[PDB]
Amino acid sequence: NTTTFKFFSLGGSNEVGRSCHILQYKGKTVMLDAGIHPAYQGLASLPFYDEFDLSKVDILLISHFHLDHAASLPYVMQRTNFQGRVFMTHPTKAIYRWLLRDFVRVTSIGGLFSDEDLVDSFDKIETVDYHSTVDVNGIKFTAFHAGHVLGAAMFQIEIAGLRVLFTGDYSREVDRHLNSAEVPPLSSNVLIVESTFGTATHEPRLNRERKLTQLIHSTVMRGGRVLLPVFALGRAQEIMLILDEYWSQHADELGGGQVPIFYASNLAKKCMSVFQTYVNMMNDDIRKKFRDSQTNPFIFKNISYLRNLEDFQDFGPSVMLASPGMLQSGLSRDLLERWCPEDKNLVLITGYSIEGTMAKFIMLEPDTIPSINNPEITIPRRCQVEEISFAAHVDFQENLEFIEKISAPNIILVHGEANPMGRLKSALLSNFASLKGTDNEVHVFNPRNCVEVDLEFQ
Amino acid sequence: SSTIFYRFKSQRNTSRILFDGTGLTVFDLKREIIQENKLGDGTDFQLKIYNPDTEEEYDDDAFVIPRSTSVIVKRSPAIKGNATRYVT
Ligand SMILES: [Zn+2]
Ligand SMILES: [Zn+2]
């Protein structure tokens, strides 16, 4: 009379990181995302794939290119018994192409990606357009706008009438270049939604931008250099839009070579050309100015590109947008160990720092940090540490409003630490206490990893 | 001089643990697998060893697995309920 809908995560439940969720219903199996945990390396960074037969997965959908959602895909497609089909949006695949080599190196610590594996690790990935339903052996799915970063999507899946909405990571506040998350025209029986910020509240965009610009403006005037740890691309372009506009608003003070802006990454050149070729997939505010001046708004006048530090003359104040975002390795870590001994330098965290990473540890203002090249030699940390969120996650009120607009009878929380997730659950159960006991009673689940949630339907 | 074949259940290839003698304890085999694959201090996972044919678990760390045996390995979330005892 009733069949069982089955949910369980291989990672990213009651935590942020190594996102991977499995759905089973009427003999079909869907995998949502395939990330790693930035606090670990090698196999230790992987979802708990040993707990599920990956050969049973029919389709694998990737919400966006961030490392905690896609960095486990090369491993899944090369080292496991996975044989299903993989889907992502066009900008996600175009960006994923250049994150591929760095994703492999993180999971292959315990070899290196070659051009031969480029066929199986990349060409096999299929792309979907937004709002265009794909049907694969009875599993229908549709990509909707999610905000967050370019190419990010929410997926509504339909299996024999049952509809499930996966938000991935999403935002609803109007971005400076991204379309905000949308409500699918059709209802959903199950909502899988992120819980990153829990019940916390964030300030409006105009307040965070002014707080960001005035903070950096005060730091560089006193002779301090600013380091902004960012992911290779995504949110870094939003910060560059804020700074390149602000720098020209005050070009008499910081124009030309006066305190130059640097976008330091070994993907700087290619990450930009992807952004300049997907403008038509962005919000109307950015395409108007793309149509107004007829010049690409992502061609920054007050920002220069830097690929390594081999020929980087560092004297005088300068603002440094460097990758990786968690300061776990790479360039941003090298400049962190180089600029933190000075007390009036600023390390400004703009994204969500995952538990166990150096970006999270530096916000506790330690006296010293261990050097990356050898751990048992410490470096004094005197620099100023601040945090202004541009992570493009919904806060409590934005999340609750979207959840209420979906109005699913079953909510499954993912992608949040245990404490903020558990507080979000209580608020949702309290907000829906009126319907408790009636036919529209809302059930909320906050499962841990590898814990099955079983739902009965028609 | 002796070897035990192991494979993570989600992985395609098989690896080896080299040692000396007739066999290894379930404890030492788990310890070697953790260290060889840099799995961590054991607070983030559990490690369980299984028989590939009967699918029964080697649930006793004192059992000596004879040389040339093959086993299936599963790394699961931590619930002592973890793998720290195979690291300390
Ligand atoms: Zn994300
Ligand atoms: Zn995420």
Residue numbers in the entry:
A (entry chain A): 5 to 114, 126 to 473
B (entry chain B): 2 to 80, 99 to 107
Pull text from the paper.
Cleavage and polyadenylation factor (CPF/CPSF) is a multi-protein complex essential for formation of eukaryotic mRNA 3ʹ ends. CPF cleaves pre-mRNAs at a specific site and adds a poly(A) tail. In contrast, there is little mechanistic information available on the nuclease module, which is composed of the endonuclease Ysh1/CPSF73, the pseudo-nuclease Cft2/CPSF100, and the multi-domain protein Mpe1/RBBP6 (Casañal et al., 2017). In vivo studies and reconstitution assays using extracts found that many of the CPF subunits were required for nuclease activity (Zhao et al., 1999) and that Ysh1/CPSF73 is the enzymatic component (Chanfreau et al., 1996, Dominski, 2010, Jenny et al., 1996, Ryan et al., 2004).
To investigate the molecular details of the Ysh1-Mpe1 interaction, we determined the X-ray crystal structure of a complex between the catalytic domain of Ysh1 (residues 1–473) and the UBL domain of Mpe1 (residues 1–120). The structure was refined to 2.3 Å resolution. Ysh1 adopts a globular fold comprised of a metallo-β-lactamase and β-CASP domain, similar to the human 3ʹ endonuclease CPSF73 and yeast Cft2 (Mandel et al., 2006). Residues H68, H70, D72, H73, H163, D184, and H430 comprise the active site, coordinating two Zn2+ ions with octahedral geometry. The catalytic core is located in a large internal solvent-filled cavity at the boundary between the metallo-β-lactamase and β-CASP domains, with a narrow tunnel leading to the surface of the enzyme. The UBL domain of Mpe1 consists of a central α helix flanked by a curved 4-stranded β sheet and capped by an additional pair of short anti-parallel β strands, in the same configuration as the UBL domain of the human ortholog RBBP6 (root mean square deviation [RMSD] = 1.36 Å over 452 atoms; (Pugh et al., 2006)). The interface between Mpe1 and Ysh1 buries an area of ∼900 Å2 and involves hydrophobic, polar, and electrostatic contacts between Mpe1 residues in loops and β strands and Ysh1 residues on the top surface of the metallo-β-lactamase domain. Mpe1 binds to the Ysh1 metallo-β-lactamase domain next to the active site tunnel opening. A large basic patch is formed by contiguous surfaces of both Ysh1 and Mpe1, suggesting a possible role in RNA binding. However, in the structure, Ysh1 remains in a “closed” conformation that is unlikely to be catalytically active because the active site tunnel is too narrow to accommodate the entire RNA substrate.
